[PDB]
Paper text:
The trimeric spike (S) protein is the major glycoprotein on the SARS-CoV-2 envelope and is responsible for engaging the ACE2 receptor for viral entry, and thus, it is a prime target for vaccine design and therapeutic antibody development. Receptor-binding domain (RBD) in the S protein plays an essential role in ACE2 receptor recognition, and mutations in the RBD affecting receptor binding and viral infection have been reported. To unravel the underlying molecular mechanism of the S proteins of Omicron BA.2, BA.2.12.1, BA.2.75, and BA.4/5 bound to hACE2, we determined their atomic structures of the S (BA.2, BA.2.12.1 or BA.4/5) or RBD (BA.2.75) in complex with hACE2 by cryo-EM or X-ray crystallography. According to our previous reports, the binding interface between RBD and ACE2 could be divided into two patches (patch 1 and patch 2).
Compared with RBD from BA.2, the RBD of BA.4/5 has three distinct mutations (L452R, F486V and R493Q), which displays different binding patterns in the complex interface. The KD of BA.4/5 RBD binding to hACE2 was approximately 9.0 ± 1.7 nM, which is ~2.6- and ~1.6-fold higher than that of the PT (23.8 ± 2.6 nM) and BA.2 (14.6 ± 2.1 nM) RBDs, respectively, while BA.2.75 RBD (7.5 ± 0.2 nM) has a similar binding capacity for hACE2 to BA.4/5 (9.0 ± 1.7 nM). Interestingly, the side chain of H34 adopts two alternative conformations in the BA.4/5 RBD/hACE2 complex, in contrast to the other three complexes. H34 of hACE2 forms an H-bond with Y453 of the BA.4/5 RBD or S494 of the BA.2.12.1 RBD. While in BA.2.75 and BA.4/5 RBD, R493 is substituted by Q493, which is hydrogen-bonded with K31 in the BA.4/5 RBD/hACE2 complex. In the BA.4/5 RBD/hACE2 complex, Q493 forms an H-bond with hACE2, as observed in other variants carrying this mutation. Furthermore, Y453, which is close to Q493, forms an additional H-bond with hACE2 in BA.4/5 RBD/hACE2 complex. Although the H-bonds were absent between Q493 and K31 in the BA.2.75 RBD/hACE2 complex, there are more Van der Waals’ contacts between Q493 of BA.2.75 and K31 of hACE2 than that between R493 of BA.2 and K31 of hACE2. In addition, substitution F486V in the BA.4/5 RBD decreases its hydrophobic interactions with L79, M82, and Y83 in hACE2. The binding assay showed that the binding affinity for hACE2 decreased ~9.8 fold when Q493 of BA.4/5 was mutated to R493. The cryo-EM structure of BA.4/5 RBD in complex with hACE2 in this paper further indicates that R493Q reverse mutation makes K31 and its near residues of hACE2 more approach the RBD and form more Van der Waals’ contacts and H-bonds, contributing to the enhanced binding affinity between RBD and hACE2.
Numbering used by the authors:
A (entry chain A): 19 to 614
B (entry chain B): 333 to 527
Write the structure that this text describes.
Amino acid sequence: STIEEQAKTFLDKFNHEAEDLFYQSSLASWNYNTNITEENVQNMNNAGDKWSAFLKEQSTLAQMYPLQEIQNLTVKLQLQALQQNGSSVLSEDKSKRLNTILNTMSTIYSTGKVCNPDNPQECLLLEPGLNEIMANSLDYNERLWAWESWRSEVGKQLRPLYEEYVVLKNEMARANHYEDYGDYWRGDYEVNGVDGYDYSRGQLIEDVEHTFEEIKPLYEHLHAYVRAKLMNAYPSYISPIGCLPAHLLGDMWGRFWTNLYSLTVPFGQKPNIDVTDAMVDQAWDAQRIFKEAEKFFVSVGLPNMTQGFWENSMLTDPGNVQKAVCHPTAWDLGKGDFRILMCTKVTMDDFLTAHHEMGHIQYDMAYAAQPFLLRNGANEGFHEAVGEIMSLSAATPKHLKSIGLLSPDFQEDNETEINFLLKQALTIVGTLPFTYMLEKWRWMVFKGEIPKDQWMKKWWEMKREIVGVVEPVPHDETYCDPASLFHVSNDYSFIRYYTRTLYQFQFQEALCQAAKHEGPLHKCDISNSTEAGQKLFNMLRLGKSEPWTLALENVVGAKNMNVRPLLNYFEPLFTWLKDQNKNSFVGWSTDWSPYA
Amino acid sequence: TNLCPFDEVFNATRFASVYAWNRKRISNCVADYSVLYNFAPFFAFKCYGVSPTKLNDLCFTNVYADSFVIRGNEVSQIAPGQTGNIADYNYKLPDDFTGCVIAWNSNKLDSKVGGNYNYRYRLFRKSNLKPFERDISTEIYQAGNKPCNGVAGVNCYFPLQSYGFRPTYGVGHQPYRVVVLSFELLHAPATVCGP
Ligand SMILES: *[C@@H]1O[C@H](CO[C@@H]2O[C@@H](C)[C@@H](O)[C@@H](O)[C@@H]2O)[C@@H](O[C@@H]2O[C@H](CO)[C@@H](O)[C@H](O)[C@H]2NC(C)=O)[C@H](O)[C@H]1NC(C)=O
Ligand SMILES: *[C@@H]1O[C@H](CO)[C@@H](O[C@@H]2O[C@H](CO)[C@@H](O)[C@H](O)[C@H]2NC(C)=O)[C@H](O)[C@H]1NC(C)=O
Ligand SMILES: *[C@@H]1O[C@H](CO)[C@@H](O)[C@H](O)[C@H]1NC(C)=O
Ligand SMILES: *[C@@H]1O[C@H](CO)[C@@H](O)[C@H](O)[C@H]1NC(C)=O
Ligand SMILES: *[C@@H]1O[C@H](CO)[C@@H](O)[C@H](O)[C@H]1NC(C)=O
Ligand SMILES: *[C@@H]1O[C@H](CO)[C@@H](O)[C@H](O)[C@H]1NC(C)=O
Ligand SMILES: *[C@@H]1O[C@H](CO)[C@@H](O)[C@H](O)[C@H]1NC(C)=O
Ligand SMILES: [Zn+2]
C-alpha cells in the first residue's frame, strides 16, 4: 500500500475518537461555566487532562507519514496541524522554566495593587479602581499618579522575567525550523501550494505598512481635532504643535479614545439614538430580542436555530441560587450542539450583542460538515469580522423603524450623522496606529534589531512618530511599559484586530453592493436581500479547507487586504474635519515634551 | 385468524447493531399493514416496487423483516444504489429491490447521560459487501505492509467502533430505528397476503 492510504485510514480513526473526547471536555467546561462548584472544577480538569493526553499521544503517531509524499491538499492540511511539535522540542528543565515564567507573569499582572502615598489602608487594584480614575477624572495630577504608579510597581517587576521569556521562546521557534518567534506568529497567514493564491510570511509586514501609509491623513485630522478640543479642558498643559500626553486619552494605555466623546462632541445639543425607553415601554424580554435577531438572520436566507438552542442555552442571570460567569460567548460543543451563554438585559447594547453572538453561531453552523481539524475560520480574522458586520446593520435608523422601536415620523438630520461618525471613529480609527506600533515593536524585539539596553528608548521614539503621543515623565531601562498590557504579559497575538478591522468594511461594502443600496455606505441594511446572503454563505461553508485568499475572493472579488472600503465609510467626517481644521496646525513635532 | 407477528418486530424492547442486524422470516399468516401505520412519527416511510395503498391485495411467498439502529444522517443511505460506510461495510441492498423501508426516531429510548456504548458499527473492511450479507468477524485490520500478529498497534486497527448517543445531540446524530421489509415470490405456492 501507499503512504496516502495509510494516512487516510489514520485520519479516519482520529476524526472519530477526537469528536467524542472534545464533546466530553466541552460539556464539562459548560457545566463549570454555568454553575460554580469544586466538583465541576474537578470534572473539567479531568476532561481537559484526558483531551490533552489524547492529542499529545496522537501527535507522535502522525510523524510516520512524510509530508512530501501526499498530494491531496486536504489530507496534507490535517496532517500539518497534527505534526506541530510546540514546546516539546525543548529540554524538560527549560520547559518547566518557561511555564514558571508564564505563570509568574500572569500572577503578577492579575494581583497587582497600588497603595496611595502615606496611607497603607487604601490600595487600589486595576479593575475596578485605577480603570475608573483613568476613564472618569478631569484632573491632571490624579491621572498622572495612577499612570506612573502602575508602571512603577507592576511594570518594573516584570522586565527580568520578560528577558528570559524572550530568550526561551526564541529557542523553541528556532528548533521548530523557524527564524524567530515573530515568524512563528506570522505563520498563520502562510499559504503554500495552490497557484495564484500563495502567500509568504514576509508579505504581511509589507502589506500592513502599505495599508497604514493610506490611513495617515484621516488620523492626522482626527488627532488635530482632538488636540484642539483637549486644550479647553487642560488649558496650560497642551502645546498646539506638540503631541498628546499619554495620561489624557480616556484609557490606561490609549488603546481606545471612546471616553473622550463627552469632551469632543461636535453638536452637544442633539442627542444620539437610544431605543431603551421604547424597549421597556413595549414589555420586551430577552426571548423577544433573540427572536428578532433570528428573524433578521432568516430574512437573508440563512436557516433557523435548532430546537436544542432554545432548550440548552441560558439567556438570563440565574439569580442567587446559582453563580455563573456573565461574559457573552457562543459555544459549539460539537455533534450538532450550539449554545449561547449571556446574561441578557433590556438595552440596545445587549440587542447588538445578540446579533454578534448569533452571527458567530451561524458561522459555526456553516462548516459543521467539514473534518474536525478544518472546523475553524479561514484565519484568525474572519470570525469577528462576520460577527461585527451583523451588528453594523442592526443599528441603522431604517432597521429600527422597520421593527417599530423608532417612531415612523422620525426624520434624520445631517448633524446626528456627524455625531455617530465621530463616535465610530474614536473607537475604530483611534486604535490602528497603536496596534501597528505594538506589533512592529514586538517583531523588532524578537528579531534582534533592538538591543536589550535600548528597549524603552525605542518604545518612546516610535510613539512620538507613529501614534503621536508623548510620555509625561522620563523613563529608563528599569521599566517595561509594554509588559503592562494584558496581551504582552500573557502570551497572545495582537495583529488580529488590524486584520479584522480591515476585513469587516470590505465585507460590508461587497454585501451592500449586492443589495443594490444607493447612498452613503453607513446607511446600509442588508435585510430582505437573498442575493446578499448566498454570497456570504459561499464563503462561510468552506472553513479551513481552502486558502483565505480564495475565501476572500468568493466575497469581495479581490485576493488581498485593502483599505479603500474603510475610507469610503468615513468620507463625510473627513470633509467636515478638513473644514473644521482650517485654522489649526495638522501634524505634530517629536521634540516637545511636558518634562522639558 | 392468525395475524402476522408485526408487533414483536416493531415494538421490541432492544434492537441490534448494524454489523449484526436481525432477520425474521414471515410465512403462513395473513398480513394487516394498517397496524404498521401506528407510531405516527416516521422520519422515513419509502416503498420501491409495490405501492403502500395497493399492498393489501397482493399475495407473496415469504416476507423478510430486517431490523437495526443507525444515526440520523445515514437513513438516506439505506436506499438502492448508495455509497458510504453503512452501504459498503454494514448493510447492502440490491439494485432490483422490491419492498419498504421504515425509520423513526428513538432518542428517548436509546440515549443515556454519559454515553450508550452498546451500539457499534464497522469502519474498516478489506472489500465491499455483497447484498444481504453479514460480517461479524473481529479480526485486526492491517493498513500497512507489515503483519499485525493479532495485536492492535501501528497501522493495525480494531474494525468496530461505538456511537456514544447522548440526549443533548443534534437531530443528525440521534438514534433512529430502521426496519426493512422485503417480499419474495418464489416458485413455491403463495401463502402470505392480506384479508
Ligand atoms: C422586509 O420585508 C417585510 C415584508 O414585506 C413584504 O416583502 C418585501 C420584500 C416587500 O416586497 C414589501 O413590499 C412586502 O410588503 C417587511 O415587513 C412588512 O413591512 C410593511 C411596511 O409597510 C408592513 O406594512 C408589513 O406589515 C410588514 N409585514 C410584517 C411585519 O410581517 C419588512 O419591513 C422589510 N424589512 C425592511 C424594510 O427593513
Ligand atoms: C518533532 O520532534 C521530533 C523529535 O522530537 C522530530 O522527529 C525527529 O526528526 C528528526 C529530523 O531529522 C529525525 O532525524 C528523527 O529520526 C525524528 N525522530 C526522533 C525520535 O528524533 C520531528 O521531526 C519534529 N517535528 C517536526 C515537524 O519537525
Ligand atoms: C448545579 O446547579 C443546579 C441548579 O440549582 C443544582 O441543582 C446542582 O446541584 C448544581 N450542581 C452541583 C454539582 O452542585
Ligand atoms: C482529496 O481527497 C479527498 C478524500 O475524500 C477527495 O474527496 C478529493 O477529491 C481529493 N482531492 C483531489 C484534488 O483529488
Ligand atoms: C423558522 O421557524 C419559524 C417558526 O418556527 C417558521 O415559521 C419558519 O418557516 C422557519 N423557517 C425555515 C426556513 O424553516
Ligand atoms: C447640514 O445641513 C445644513 C443645512 O443647510 C448646512 O448648513 C450644514 O452645513 C450641513 N452640515 C453640517 C455639518 O451641519
Ligand atoms: C408497544 O408496547 C407498548 C407497551 O405495552 C404499548 O403501550 C404500545 O401500545 C405498543 N405499540 C402498539 C403499536 O401497540
Ligand atoms: Zn465575538
